[PDB]
Amino acid sequence: RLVTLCFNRRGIVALVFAMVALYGWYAWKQLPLEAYPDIADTTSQVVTQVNGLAAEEVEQQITIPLEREIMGVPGMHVMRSKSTFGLSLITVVFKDGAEDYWSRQRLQERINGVSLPYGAQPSLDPLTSPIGEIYRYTLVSKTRDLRELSELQFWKVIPRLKQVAGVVDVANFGGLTTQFMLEFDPVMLSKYNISLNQITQAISENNANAGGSILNRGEQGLVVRGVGLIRNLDDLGNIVVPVLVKDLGRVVLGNPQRHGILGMDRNPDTIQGITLLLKNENPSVVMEGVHAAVRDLNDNILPKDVKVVPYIDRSNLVDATVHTVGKTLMEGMFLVSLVLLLFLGSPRAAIIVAVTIPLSLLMAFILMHHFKIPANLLSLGAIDFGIIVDGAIVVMENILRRRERDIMQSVLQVARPIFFGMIVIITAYLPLFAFQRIEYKLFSPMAFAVGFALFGALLVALLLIPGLAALVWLAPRYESVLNRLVGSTRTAIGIAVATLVGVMILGATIGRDFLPYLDEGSIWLQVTLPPGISLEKAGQMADNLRAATMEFPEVEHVVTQVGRNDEGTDPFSPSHIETAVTLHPYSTWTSGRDKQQLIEAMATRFRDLPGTQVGFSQPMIDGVLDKLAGAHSDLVVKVYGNDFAETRQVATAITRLLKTVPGAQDVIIDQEPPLPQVRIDVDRAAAARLGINVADVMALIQTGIGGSPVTQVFVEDRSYNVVARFIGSSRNDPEAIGNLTLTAANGAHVALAQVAHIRLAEGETTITREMNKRHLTVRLNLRGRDLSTFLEEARMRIDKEVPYDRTHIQVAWGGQFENQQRAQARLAVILPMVLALMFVLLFGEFKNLRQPALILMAVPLATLGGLVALHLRGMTLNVSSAVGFIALFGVAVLNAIIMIANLSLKEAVVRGAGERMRPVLMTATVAALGLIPAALAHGLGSDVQRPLATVVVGGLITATALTLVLLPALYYLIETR
Amino acid sequence: TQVNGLAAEEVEQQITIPLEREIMGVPGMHVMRSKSTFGLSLITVVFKDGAEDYWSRQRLQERINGVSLPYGAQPSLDPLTSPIGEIYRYTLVSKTRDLR
Amino acid sequence: DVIIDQEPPLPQVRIDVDRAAAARLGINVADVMALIQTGIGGSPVTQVFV
Amino acid sequence: YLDEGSIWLQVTLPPGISLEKAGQMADNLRAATMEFPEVEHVVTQVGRND
Amino acid sequence: GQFENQQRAQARLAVILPMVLALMFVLLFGEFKNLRQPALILMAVPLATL
Numbered sequence A: 001r002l003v004t005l006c007f008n009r010r011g012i013v014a015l016v017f018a019m020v021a022l023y024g025w026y027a028w029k030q031l032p033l034e035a036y037p038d039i040a041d042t043t044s045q046v047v048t049q050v051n052g053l054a055a056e057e058v059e060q061q062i063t064i065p066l067e068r069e070i071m072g073v074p075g076m077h078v079m080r081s082k083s084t085f086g087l088s089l090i091t092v093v094f095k096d097g098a099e100d101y102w103s104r105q106r107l108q109e110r111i112n113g114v115s116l117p118y119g120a121q122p123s124l125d126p127l128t129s130p131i132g133e134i135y136r137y138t139l140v141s142k143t144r145d146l147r148e149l150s151e152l153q154f155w156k157v158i159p160r161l162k163q164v165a166g167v168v169d170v171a172n173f174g175g176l177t178t179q180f181m182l183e184f185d186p187v188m189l190s191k192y193n194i195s196l197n198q199i200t201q202a203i204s205e206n207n208a209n210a211g212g213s214i215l216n217r218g219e220q221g222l223v224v225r226g227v228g229l230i231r232n233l234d235d236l237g238n239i240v241v242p243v244l245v246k247d248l249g250r251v252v253l254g255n256p257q258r259h260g261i262l263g264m265d266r267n268p269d270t271i272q273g274i275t276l277l278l279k280n281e282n283p284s285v286v287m288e289g290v291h292a293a294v295r296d297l298n299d300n301i302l303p304k305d306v307k308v309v310p311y312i313d314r315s316n317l318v319d320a321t322v323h324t325v326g327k328t329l330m331e332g333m334f335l336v337s338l339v340l341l342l343f344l345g346s347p348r349a350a351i352i353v354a355v356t357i358p359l360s361l362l363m364a365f366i367l368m369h370h371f372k373i374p375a376n377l378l379s380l381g382a383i384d385f386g387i388i389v390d391g392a393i394v395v396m397e398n399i400l401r402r403r404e405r406d407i408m409q410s411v412l413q414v415a416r417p418i419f420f421g422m423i424v425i426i427t428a429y430l431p432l433f434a435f436q437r438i439e440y441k442l443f444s445p446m447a448f449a450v451g452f453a454l455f456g457a458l459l460v461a462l463l464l465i466p467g468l469a470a471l472v473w474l475a476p477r478y479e480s481v482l483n484r485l486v487g488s489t490r491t492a493i494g495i496a497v498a499t500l501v502g503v504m505i506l507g508a509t510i511g512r513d514f515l516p517y518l519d520e521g522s523i524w525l526q527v528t529l530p531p532g533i534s535l536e537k538a539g540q541m542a543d544n545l546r547a548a549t550m551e552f553p554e555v556e557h558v559v560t561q562v563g564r565n566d567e568g569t570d571p572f573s574p575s576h577i578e579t580a581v582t583l584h585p586y587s588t589w590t591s592g593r594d595k596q597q598l599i600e601a602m603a604t605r606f607r608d609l610p611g612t613q614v615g616f617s618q619p620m621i622d623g624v625l626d627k628l629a630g631a632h633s634d635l636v637v638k639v640y641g642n643d644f645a646e647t648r649q650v651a652t653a654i655t656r657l658l659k660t661v662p663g664a665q666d667v668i669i670d671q672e673p674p675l676p677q678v679r680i681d682v683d684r685a686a687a688a689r690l691g692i693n694v695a696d697v698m699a700l701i702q703t704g705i706g707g708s709p710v711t712q713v714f715v716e717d718r719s720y721n722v723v724a725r726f727i728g729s730s731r732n733d734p735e736a737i738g739n740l741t742l743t744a745a746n747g748a749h750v751a752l753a754q755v756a757h758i759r760l761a762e763g764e765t766t767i768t769r770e771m772n773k774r775h776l777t778v779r780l781n782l783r784g785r786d787l788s789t790f791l792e793e794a795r796m797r798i799d800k801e802v803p804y805d806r807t808h809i810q811v812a813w814g815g816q817f818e819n820q821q822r823a824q825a826r827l828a829v830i831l832p833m834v835l836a837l838m839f840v841l842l843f844g845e846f847k848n849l850r851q852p853a854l855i856l857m858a859v860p861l862a863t864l865g866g867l868v869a870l871h872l873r874g875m876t877l878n879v880s881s882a883v884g885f886i887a888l889f890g891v892a893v894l895n896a897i898i899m900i901a902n903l904s905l906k907e908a909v910v911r912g913a914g915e916r917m918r919p920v921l922m923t924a925t926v927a928a929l930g931l932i933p934a935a936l937a938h939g940l941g942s943d944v945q946r947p948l949a950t951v952v953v954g955g956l957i958t959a960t961a962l963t964l965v966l967l968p969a970l971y972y973l974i975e976t977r
Numbered sequence B: 001t002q003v004n005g006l007a008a009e010e011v012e013q014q015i016t017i018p019l020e021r022e023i024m025g026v027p028g029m030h031v032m033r034s035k036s037t038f039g040l041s042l043i044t045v046v047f048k049d050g051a052e053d054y055w056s057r058q059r060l061q062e063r064i065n066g067v068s069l070p071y072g073a074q075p076s077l078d079p080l081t082s083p084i085g086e087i088y089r090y091t092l093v094s095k096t097r098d099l100r
Numbered sequence C: 001d002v003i004i005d006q007e008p009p010l011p012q013v014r015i016d017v018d019r020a021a022a023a024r025l026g027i028n029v030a031d032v033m034a035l036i037q038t039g040i041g042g043s044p045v046t047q048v049f050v
Numbered sequence D: 001y002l003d004e005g006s007i008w009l010q011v012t013l014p015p016g017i018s019l020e021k022a023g024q025m026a027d028n029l030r031a032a033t034m035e036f037p038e039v040e041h042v043v044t045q046v047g048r049n050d
Numbered sequence E: 001g002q003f004e005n006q007q008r009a010q011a012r013l014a015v016i017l018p019m020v021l022a023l024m025f026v027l028l029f030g031e032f033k034n035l036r037q038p039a040l041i042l043m044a045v046p047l048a049t050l
């Protein structure tokens, strides 16, 4: 048909595929690439930051009435709220299909128009993915101290980076926020007869400038203005309170309560920042921009001694992924070309078949460009060109073997079975298109790239290729085993059935997981400290931990983040550390251990550390795990109910129980035990007898101890706060606070201990609520075992060996298990449906109804090697492995089609099978040896497609081993009976 | 942001600059300029090509609100329109009335 | 047509509150500011709805 | 080009001038422009809009 | 200024300008199958330019 008009097009079609190749190049160049695809489903958080409030106060008086509004939001999937000291954090994760800015507008519509009595203004966190951390930088200097570095961060580095297109915000960590401060003794306020209310209502009475509009003199108008704005620390001392504010206790620089403390190698205190890309923006480009920005800072904007340098960069992961995938695919192409050169005699011809490889890819890139399909280098890691090139094989086998005039005839003869074989392959990838969410967002471009390559393969195998112009002992041995296939149908069905039961036994018992760990270039650490710890002590424990990590030759820079960032994104207390461990290049390691083994070594090492429990993650996967269900972990056990102590008890029981089960590895109770509080309970009776308003006491507490800013000072473009605070030991303890004074209606200083009863009681550190219900969480990561097997052995012992209930407290599970199960169900729904469609496709070509049955039931022959590989290699059955089975089944049923199409009763079978031996063995060989180099372990971005490749290769070995023996025997057993 | 009587330097200092600080990270922004002067601060933002209108204005709106606002000034986005979009220019004319 | 765009700086009467003298006579800077705010240029005390 | 049916003018005056004086400047600009037989209307906007 | 558009467009066409004349070359080569001839007919472009 087209192969007729093709020959005289020899010049034209060449230019066609050439310019098309160029358009494919431009397609790739304009095709945004992703090393680590965005895993996390659409979600957003509302951050209400209340200055001084305790955890309980935040939860009850802020978080809950916010929950009442947020609860009925459109597209709501799960709504959780963590309320910690000075912070109310509401994480809302939405359903599948809700876009970002939409749901953002919805939450924004909910959280506005609320009350929030403390002046708390709820706000949505930056719009970014949990994988959004790209440039993590620390600005360093060998002279300048922390405060100067902090100023440089705030007023130089932050805005400059924030200008970068693609960057939503840059989160600030550590450092010192500078404020103008007044340090004075209450004995002095009792000395000069001044109330604590008066001094603050004074210092903040006047800070301002005033426009006086326009004053007319002659024909020239003059703007009337005036300046009362305090420009410095000295201007503060002169506020009237002839007693000066400076004659009153000293006026100096200071900082508010530190929300977080950061450290790096041998550096207990420093400052860093975290660049957040905006949502769906391609990381590498935004990284080019931020690279330009950073170098613009270091070379130009920042002082000579201060230089911003990153401890974490996404472009590095990108480059490592690029190198690994590049080397892999290059090796694949080389092996295909090599084996092609080995089977096919003529080298030039082998090249003619070889040019099918780059062209069909360039065919696909044009489509992926116009369909806006991104290129995930990890999923595109498995292609192997043992599918795409098969179409070029069967014709080349057809032509050449037919020769040793008009080639279009035999090309036409082989045109029908290969085209339907092509459709069979592309329809076999239907279940990949079927599944949704994470696994889709991961594997999607592979299925499209292959399918579009299949269409591009036919374009090469027809409009180009035909228009281009030890086996000796393998032959009779094959005739010998086909000769053994005569009759013996009982022993033959013995073999077939034994193989079926084989994959049954081997398949039924095996590990069932979700994803193969998706290695990154670092390690994230979740550390929990003792309850009620000061920032200083937390920083010291962080120092010791960080120093214990640096002991390892594999680590490079250990960054420890104590508490939470100044932005309010993380609901972390001072009792919590997040440690970023950046490993050296894997080749530089002088210790033999693999990353997992290093993980175990670090774990066992940290077990010898005082007051520290360390869970293990990687930064991005940690983010998406956090967004997934309850916490940062592979799995969680949630204990519901409104009683904190009760849920605490049961959660301790389950916490201790999970440590018994082999699968579970890192087990923590999550929310820290309650911390010591000094509780001031105002007695209104005594307040009535002494004539004291509660507002006075509350103000004394907030401004006296806390130092909530009284006014705001403006200096140049910069601004700071101004705070009047009791000095040092003024409050060291309950007794001192009791002896503090405030005014009265009768004009006499009264100690608050005469009115407000001061006691000591512990209270919850962080209150977590899932869907308007209070609960606690047991965080657990599992390592060294299977997920499904672990929930098999555990999850029973929880419902058996753990006594609970009476009043409320019901348990529950969460983490990646629910995700894996959803994917499993979604796969098993579309799985039988595609079997039926491929059953009609097989019924279309042969139209005997026997061949569809036989060929479609040739699949378990392929399943064998898929299972023996995953068992022998020690791998696990998962999404990637499942995909492996998909592709494997595709090439298996294709090879069955090709074999049977060409298939003296049993002699017809022997000769018929013999004729088709070469292209079957060849296509099998190239398809296996295609994904063989992708089974090479070492690399970054290396393991996604590794199990895919394993299943494909092993499965293909056994599929081909069986199909050249069992298949024609079964054929002979049916068609002759 | 229109605040009457306030001088130029104070308009830049206490109004324009913080508003700019909260605006800057705005999604898909091309160039932001600001002119600060007696009576008001005008912050103009042009967006990278291919940006929807109500989208952009929703972003700007999502930024400017919830800020300092010393003098009671209330930042508000100018009417959605185009430089070529003033289609009618009229005058009120009467012999028998006055400007009030 | 070539100009400097933004015009040269205008004359202004600058009222700078002296902190020391404000301490000596006991005056809040707020009093003075609001004096040149409400008193001189003027600020609306309230709104009348007819 | 791409001319419309009109001519627009960007005018800068002495710095910090009174709005009344600038009003008079506008008046002289209009009066001087109207001397052209080709112009039907000359509209001056001094200051800004509301 | 306005040149921001100019330098954007001047390069813009310059990217796709040879691209279409290379595509036109493909077409002309398609029907005639000659090499010299579509080159000669492609030489008609500067003739009109004058």
Ligand SMILES: [Zn+2]
Pocket: A570, A623
């Ligand atoms: Zn985080």
Ligand SMILES: [Zn+2]
Pocket: A169
């Ligand atoms: Zn910010």
